Amino acid sequence: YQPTPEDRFTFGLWTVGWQGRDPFGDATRRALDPVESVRRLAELGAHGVTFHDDDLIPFGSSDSEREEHVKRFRQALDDTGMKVPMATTNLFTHPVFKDGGFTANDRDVRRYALRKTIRNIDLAVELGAETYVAWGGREGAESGGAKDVRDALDRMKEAFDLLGEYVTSQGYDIRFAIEPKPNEPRGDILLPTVGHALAFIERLERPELYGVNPEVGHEQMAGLNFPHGIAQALWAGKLFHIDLNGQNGIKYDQDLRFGAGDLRAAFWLVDLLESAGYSGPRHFDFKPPRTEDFDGVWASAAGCMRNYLILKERAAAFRADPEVQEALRASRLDELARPTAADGLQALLDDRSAFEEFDVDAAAARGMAFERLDQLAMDHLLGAR
Amino acid sequence: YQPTPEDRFTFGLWTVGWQGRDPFGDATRRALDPVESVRRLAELGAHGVTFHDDDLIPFGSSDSEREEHVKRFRQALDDTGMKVPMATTNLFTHPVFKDGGFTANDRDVRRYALRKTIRNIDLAVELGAETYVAWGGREGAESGGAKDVRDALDRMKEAFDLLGEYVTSQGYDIRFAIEPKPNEPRGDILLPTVGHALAFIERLERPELYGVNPEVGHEQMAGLNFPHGIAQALWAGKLFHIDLNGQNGIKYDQDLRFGAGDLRAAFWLVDLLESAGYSGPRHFDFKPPRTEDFDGVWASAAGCMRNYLILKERAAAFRADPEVQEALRASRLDELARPTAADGLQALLDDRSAFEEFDVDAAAARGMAFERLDQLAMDHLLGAR
Amino acid sequence: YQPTPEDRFTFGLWTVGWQGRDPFGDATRRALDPVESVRRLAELGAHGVTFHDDDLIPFGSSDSEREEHVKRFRQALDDTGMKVPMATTNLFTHPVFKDGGFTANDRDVRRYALRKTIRNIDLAVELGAETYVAWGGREGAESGGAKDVRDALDRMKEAFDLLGEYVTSQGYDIRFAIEPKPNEPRGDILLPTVGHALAFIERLERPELYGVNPEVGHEQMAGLNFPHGIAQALWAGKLFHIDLNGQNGIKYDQDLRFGAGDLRAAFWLVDLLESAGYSGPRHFDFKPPRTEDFDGVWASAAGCMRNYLILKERAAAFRADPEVQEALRASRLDELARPTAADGLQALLDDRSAFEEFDVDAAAARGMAFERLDQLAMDHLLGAR
Amino acid sequence: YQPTPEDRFTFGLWTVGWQGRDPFGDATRRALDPVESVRRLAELGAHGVTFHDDDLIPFGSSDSEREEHVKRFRQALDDTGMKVPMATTNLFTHPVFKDGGFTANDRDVRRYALRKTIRNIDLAVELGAETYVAWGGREGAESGGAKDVRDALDRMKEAFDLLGEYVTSQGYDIRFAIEPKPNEPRGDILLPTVGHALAFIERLERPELYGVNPEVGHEQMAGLNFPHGIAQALWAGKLFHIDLNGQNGIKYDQDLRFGAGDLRAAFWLVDLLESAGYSGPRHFDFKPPRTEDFDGVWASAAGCMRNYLILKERAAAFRADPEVQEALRASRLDELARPTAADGLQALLDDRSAFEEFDVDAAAARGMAFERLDQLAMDHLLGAR
Ligand SMILES: OC[C@H]1O[C@@H](O)[C@H](O)[C@@H](O)[C@@H]1O
Ligand SMILES: OC[C@H]1O[C@@H](O)[C@H](O)[C@@H](O)[C@@H]1O
Ligand SMILES: OC[C@H]1O[C@@H](O)[C@H](O)[C@@H](O)[C@@H]1O
Ligand SMILES: OC[C@H]1O[C@@H](O)[C@H](O)[C@@H](O)[C@@H]1O
Ligand SMILES: [Mg+2]
Ligand SMILES: [Mg+2]
Ligand SMILES: [Mg+2]
Ligand SMILES: [Mg+2]
Ligand SMILES: [Mn+2]
Ligand SMILES: [Mn+2]
Ligand SMILES: [Mn+2]
Ligand SMILES: [Mn+2]
């Protein structure tokens, strides 16, 4: 289960670089030079890294410092062959963003947030990024009167439309991916789930430029089924990017390494991504627990990749097993993929076998055989057949 | 705080008619004649009732029985002046729907579910309903292999498109409202939230025919902010109907009377509905607890209406208070409603006060004053100023 | 992974016998004769069955009917070799228990609940049960004024003390196990968790007669760590019985087959039970989903046993692996088992290496190596080393 | 609703002193001199403040600095009349505590944690504290193998027994209160709820020295009913202290001002505390949101006190209302307070009206009238009768 770059595994600079500061604790690890992270991740078999503007260039840097930080970063990519498929803006750390970025009540902050993002889009395009992610972690509220949500969605649409106008006017190929999160650090965050983000996108001026970057832990933070939400994003044609990690149910954002947390949901996610032929980066947005030293950071990163590859093998064995293929037919998954009424409405209305002469009790008595199917899946996941 | 029919309060036959059967207990109350519910609700000041097909006509009824049930029902509406603004199909009680209705794996069940709905749409139009609600309570799964969600969404789109084709071919004015629910009775239910339903609707053949019927308890069952989700539905122009009740956080669907559960969220919901000028029915989808006798059923129904009216008065006093209007300006809610960059992208890019000369520390040091605003709201809710 | 009776796997009559009625649906399966369940479970390798009084003898039965039901049941145990290690009272289904049994506000109901339990304790002793379980599923409330909780705990202590007085006066060996549940069917249930039940027991007249019967899904329904709670019950010497099943986080009580739901927590539970040498029944309190027919019921029951045995093998391989034993030392699990200050308080107060000369930064810089340990556990669970 | 010191309102130095650093954001406010907090809180009507050792004396301070910090603090208490009823140890911020304090796997860290606490107990006694709080925020784990919970509970019992041995050997009157929390910053925290802490205390060498310091938000973080848990703590005689704040369901620890979050649960909490005659400090453990400036900090603190006083008035009006007293009798709250079987077990066994001649259907048909009672409570809370 050794990763190679063709597996497309990517890591944020902020993941292995996390110093371990949490709400109740100081840092447990020194800061990492982005150059060293690139080298250490390449040695593990990663394909690429991603960054926030302020991860790569310290906030407030001068032009000459900015140029030296990028030049050092570019040399580490050249030395390793690592790519930069995705980038994003930090619109959450600085105190100026305390009431939001694009939806801050203060107009001058909203304008500043847009300028900060536009500057980093240029940098991301230069480094080769195909996707620009927006995480509105500060867009939201802790109380009901502090944010008019219809007004905030107006401001959010304006911000995204202007960013779409900007990349069009430069002839950039980059697309945007919205990363939903239901809460934390705000009491409730706007566009809290995959669904809310997909619905918002359909009201933008150029919807085709925008998709979702769903994160395993963020949907599980709302108790939602992450493979189900990914399926709806695939159905809509909007899975531009994905964040992989682990999460133990409804609580603070844990960002455990992928495969920790809900192991079965991870299996069904990997099964769906491979079956659907998702071709984007397999991006890990995780935090090595602050109990770990620097050797534990890299063990945690390696674990993400390994667990993905183990699940990929087991899911593929599951789908290829003729006994599973037989069980899927017994459970009528083939019938689910058949059109309900390709004969059309009138034919359905006149079809007496659909109502007047439908034997509802005979239909009701037919078991679905889902438990035998699910136990075959569990045996395949555990390597027990 | 006495309701009148112009307040547009509506109740499902299945709410005050609930016999008190739960997963662990037998019925604690006798069944109610729909006629008596209409009379008792009218006496309380309700505007109308809603129904499932099988609430009004017992499942399996003959044509002559069906006609007598409707004739009795119609006479109770005539005697009281009560309206029927909304109707829906029971696609969840009969064992034939155990794997779903529109997305059942068995094609013959999906066709039957469509025919059952189409039959009731006719009845609902005859009784005057403006909205037909779809609650896919059985569309979902308890295990990952039992439902391919992309296939199920294909079947769901087909079902809704055919229903839209049907009402168009009859020249009906009725529109559809999807009622989301994240789980129960299925382990996870498809279109689990307001957002997922809004996103799905945008892929239907005629999206303008479909909106959402969000329920307070269903979004709170996912830990989501119900006023926020209602705001996004209003923003999208899709709040066709609403279900009001109470719910104590993330657990089984409690269906408490409106105002119980999260009292502050109820206040902010009523504030939003009145401020936005929502003109649909104020529909209560609640269950009088099975501890109650028939007198407790009607006290519970009266409580729903009363609590709405109390919250309506307090929210209106909050918005009209000049000290609150002053606090809203101090918190820059006026600036949130102003366009971020009506001067356009180029002007924003050249505006040095948006970036090069933006004093980020002065902006960051400005408090939002949200706590004083929120305490004014709490004083208004409690009648303590 | 074939179970045998020496594995001590037990099932409630109400589990495989569940007809599939849920809050929104009618039964999908016919009722089962308890005799047939005993035979079918024995054929699967089960050790025993458990029952509610009303599972074995239909409520309201005459003495002659009661005797024939028991005689038939006893013959099925004799024919199979199955045991009856545990029994319990149904104090939740009949409408008389709608406000509780032992803590019903109506005193005459509380007295009836006690008499109903005492009658079944006699029957359980006759059938050989070692444990009598109390599940106060109706003890609780949906609103704050309806139950004074200090008064209710007074009544609950009185009920349990009287039951302890009863079994002592008959010279019975049977002990009581309280089964906690945080909510459902009541809005909140008294003694909601393992901890609350353990604390309550310490106030009973004869605490040694009472322990806990924790259920996987019930603690996960509160977002709690079930292996952690089992550990505290073992630490207190109170794990008299256990209910095994699966549950997907915070939502209604799913009662999935064991191993479904949180697979990793199931692994750590089995590891703890085997390491601690728990010698009680491995009891499954699960519901075959109502999508299943009778063949799916037995496949689901077999899956419970199989998954336990797979996890038992993987946990044992994990603990016996010398590389894991090395990682546990690296993570200082050996030091955790050493007394903190066996030298005593004064020696600790005078030990300068505990404070004045403790190198806090050197200690802080030592990584715990938990991630490498946890990835070894994951590799062992998945069969990937 | 103006607080006075006889209302016993207390605040942690760390509450109004919180600089606004969260997992995703830098500080939004400057640090506060503890002296200024004492003065500002006294001016608001507070009775007292509480502290962590490291709140009052910066970590690593020399003896002469330590003495000057305390002397300044003591003068602010003398100038204001403020008391210090409670103190606690910071065993969570420094990286040395990253795997816990009393239950850290490293023995030398456990010994250091004990010495750090013992030093602060001396200081707390000098300042007059009656309660010493233990919050084991780092005692726990993110993975299953990293902590043997039976071993950790052994170490926790040893730590608490040694602290009890220490205060006894000095003749101190101070008692200990354990503050439970289910998760955050650890994935799961040991003794996660009021119940688990009460059960643990009963295994300590001198149980009478230890009680609980429950926090509104911490039990709600597990979806539990906080008034119910407080009632069980009162029933056990262990409510030594309480932390008041607000929390919106199951998510990260919000620490909103008291009264925000679940308003009805706050009402029932205040009703219970006043009815039970709780005489300890009404301590607020809250964080003014980081959107606020220093004026918003004090408005937030004032709001805590005001909301408590409003709820106190409404709860008292509720209990004194003769129509409520009539409804409580109708709902048989009087019968709940009556002993179930003061006639004894034998008399119960021979009482034919408890079983043989109990009319179960007549009992079942009697409604509890809980909804009318609960609507009276809601009318009293809202000032709407
Ligand atoms: O892409 C933006 C990223 O910013 C991070 O700091 C957030 O915590 C992530 O959830 C997000 O993926
Ligand atoms: O509109 C359909 C209705 O069916 C009911 O039985 C469900 O429980 C409701 O949530 C829903 O509103
Ligand atoms: O032991 C009593 C049993 O009664 C069942 O019907 C409950 O649902 C179980 O959780 C419990 O184990
Ligand atoms: O008493 C100890 C205190 O430490 C704080 O920093 C925790 O966040 C509180 O929950 C706790 O009350
Ligand atoms: Mg992310
Ligand atoms: Mg509804
Ligand atoms: Mg159970
Ligand atoms: Mg606290
Ligand atoms: Mn995250
Ligand atoms: Mn509902
Ligand atoms: Mn259960
Ligand atoms: Mn807290």
Using the mean position of ligand 1's atoms as its centre, give its distance from the Cα of residue A313 in Å: 29
Instruction: List strand residue ranges (DSSP E) for D39-101, in order.
Output: 48-52, 83-88
In 3D space, the residue among C283, C263, C260, C273 whose CA is nearest the CA of residue C312 turns out to be C273
Provide the token pair at B374: 């929120």
In 3D space, the residue among D47, D49, D43, D40 whose CA is nearest the CA of residue D11 turns out to be D49
* Phi, psi at A72, each rounded to 5°: -60, -40
* CB proximity list for C169: less than 8 A, separation 6 or greater: D345
Using the mean position of ligand 11's atoms as its centre, give its distance from the Cα of residue A361 in Å: 29
Distance from the first to the final alpha carbon of chain C: 20
- For D299, which DSSP code? H
Residue written as tokens 């784990």? D141
Q: Is B359 annotated as a binding residue?
A: no
Protein residue closest via CA to atom 8 of ligand 3: B24
Each residue of D327-345: b (16+ CB within 10 Å) or e?
bbeebbbebbeeebbeeeb
**Cis-peptide into B185, omega within 30 deg:** yes
Strand (E) or helix (H) holding B85: strand B83-88
Provide the token pair at C202: 């310490």
DSSP B170-190: TT---EEEE---SSSSSSEES
d(CA B178, CA C173): 57
| CB nearest to C292's CB, from A28, A371, A382 | A371
- For C18, which DSSP code? -
**Residue type, position C78, single letter:** D
Cβ contact, residue pair D340, C227, below 8 Å: no
d(CA D238, CA D213): 9
State the Cα angle at B375 between B371 and B378, rounded to 5°: 140
Using the mean position of ligand 6's atoms as its centre, give its distance from the Cα of residue B251 in Å: 16
SS3 content of chain B, % helix, strand, coil (to 5): 50, 10, 40
In 3D space, the residue among A5, A110, A129, A114 whose CA is nearest the CA of residue A56 turns out to be A129
Which residues have CB under 6 Å of ligand 3? C 14, 88, 133, 135, 179, 215, 243, 285
d(CA B211, CA B198): 7
Q: For every residue of chain A, which 3-state class applies, written as one string?
A: CCCCHHHCEEEEHHHHCCCCCECCECCCCCCCCHHHHHHHHHHHCCCEEEEEHHHHCCCCCCHHHHHHHHHHHHHHHHHHCCEEEEEECCCCCCHHHCCCCCCCCCHHHHHHHHHHHHHHHHHHHHHCCCEEEECCCCCEECCCCCCCHHHHHHHHHHHHHHHHHHHHHCCCCCEEEECCCCCCCCCEECCCCHHHHHHHHCCCCCHHHEEECCEHHHHHCCCCCHHHHHHHHHHCCCECCCEECECCCCCCCCCECECECCHHHHHHHHHHHHHHCCCCCEEECCCCCCCCCHHHHHHHHHHHHHHHHHHHHHHHHHHHCHHHHHHHHHCCHHHHCCCCCCCCHHHHHHCHHHCCCCCHHHHHHCCCCHHHHHHHHHHHHHCCC
Q: Is B253 annotated as a binding residue?
A: yes
Catalytic residue among B52, B241, B283, B380: B52
d(CA C149, CA D232): 7
Q: Chain C closest CA to B283's CA: distance in Å?
A: 20
Torsional class of A35: left (φ above 0), alpha (ψ -120 to 50), beta (otherwise) = alpha
Kindly list the residues from chain A whose CB atom is less than 8 angstroms away from the CB atom of residue B373.
143, 145-146
In 3D space, the residue among D22, D13, D6 whose CA is nearest the CA of residue D309 turns out to be D6
In 3D space, the residue among A287, D105, B250, D191 whose CA is nearest the CA of residue C224 turns out to be D191
- For B314, which DSSP code? H
d(CA D345, CA C167): 11
d(CA D329, CA B54): 39
Cβ contact, residue pair D292, B370, below 8 Å: yes
Which domain, by its residues, includes A379?
1-385
Using the mean position of ligand 11's atoms as its centre, give its distance from the Cα of residue C285 in Å: 7
In 3D space, the residue among D74, D87, D82 whose CA is nearest the CA of residue D122 turns out to be D87
d(CA C35, CA C81): 13
Protein residue closest via CA to atom 4 of ligand 4: D135
Return the bridge partners of D243, or none: D215, D283
Cβ contact, residue pair D197, C195, below 8 Å: yes
Return the bridge partners of A57, or none: none
Residue written as tokens 């509506």? B10
CA distances from D79 to B282, D49, D73, D124 (A): 57, 14, 10, 19
Question: Parallel, antiparallel, or unpaired: how do β-strands B83-88 and D131-134 relate?
Answer: unpaired
Q: Which of C14, C21, C22, C285 best tests the B interface by mutation, with the highest count of B CBs <10 A?
A: C22
- The answer to whether the CB of D90 is under 6 A from ligand 4 is no
Q: Enumerate neighbours of C (3 or more CB pairs within 8 A).
A: A, B, D
Cβ contact, residue pair C115, D354, below 8 Å: yes
- For C257, which DSSP code? P
Pair C257, C288: CB distance under 8 Å: yes
DSSP B119-130: HHHHHHHHHT-S
* CB proximity list for B208: less than 8 A, separation 6 or greater: none
Residue written as tokens 């809370």? D381
Q: Is A321 annotated as a binding residue?
A: no
Instruction: List strand residue ranges (DSSP E) for chain C, in order.
Output: 9-12, 48-52, 83-88, 131-134, 140-141, 175-178, 188-189, 210-212, 243-244, 282-284
- The answer to whether the CB of D132 is under 6 A from ligand 4 is no
Name the residue of B221, B285, B286, B287 whose CB sits within 8 Å of the most ligand 2 atoms, as the mutation to test its pocket. Answer: B285
Q: Is B285 annotated as a binding residue?
A: yes
d(CA B364, CA B350): 23
Locate the chain A residue with the closest alpha carbon to D187: A254
Using the mean position of ligand 9's atoms as its centre, give its distance from the Cα of residue A246 in Å: 9
* CB proximity list for D73: less than 8 A, separation 6 or greater: D34, D35, D38, D56, D127
For helices B294-320 and B263-276, angle between their N-to-C axes, nearest 10 degrees: 60
* CB proximity list for D184: less than 8 A, separation 6 or greater: A23, A24, A251, A252, D137, D221, D252, D253
DSSP B5-60: GGG-EEEEHHHHT----BTTB--SS----HHHHHHHHHHHT--EEEEEHHHHS-TT
Number of inter-chain CB pairs under 8 A, B vs D: 122
Using the mean position of ligand 2's atoms as its centre, give its distance from the Cα of residue B135 in Å: 6
Cβ contact, residue pair C257, A381, below 8 Å: no
Provide the token pair at D114: 């004990």
Pair A238, A201: CB distance under 8 Å: yes
What resolution in angstroms, rounded to 1 decimal?
2.0
Kindly list the residues from chain A whose CB atom is less than 8 angstroms away from the CB atom of residue B106.
332, 335, 363, 366
Name the residue of A14, A22, A55 whose CB sits within 8 Å of the most ligand 1 atoms, as the mutation to test its pocket. Answer: A14
- The answer to whether the CB of D14 is under 6 A from ligand 4 is yes
Provide the token pair at C316: 């044992």
**Residue type, position D323, single letter:** E
Provide the token pair at C71: 């005689």
d(CA D190, CA D100): 10
Locate the chain A residue with the closest alpha carbon to C380: A382
Pair C243, C213: CB distance under 8 Å: yes
Pair D296, B369: CB distance under 8 Å: yes
* Phi, psi at B85, each rounded to 5°: -80, -15
| CB nearest to A310's CB, from C262, C366, C384 | C384
Catalytic residue among D53, D54, D55, D271: D55
Total tally of structural domains belonging to chain C: 1
| CB nearest to C185's CB, from B24, B138, B187 | B24
Q: Chain C closest CA to A281's CA: distance in Å?
A: 23
Q: Is B55 a residue of the active site? A: yes
Which residues have CB under 6 Å of ligand 1? A 14, 88, 133, 135, 179, 215, 243, 285
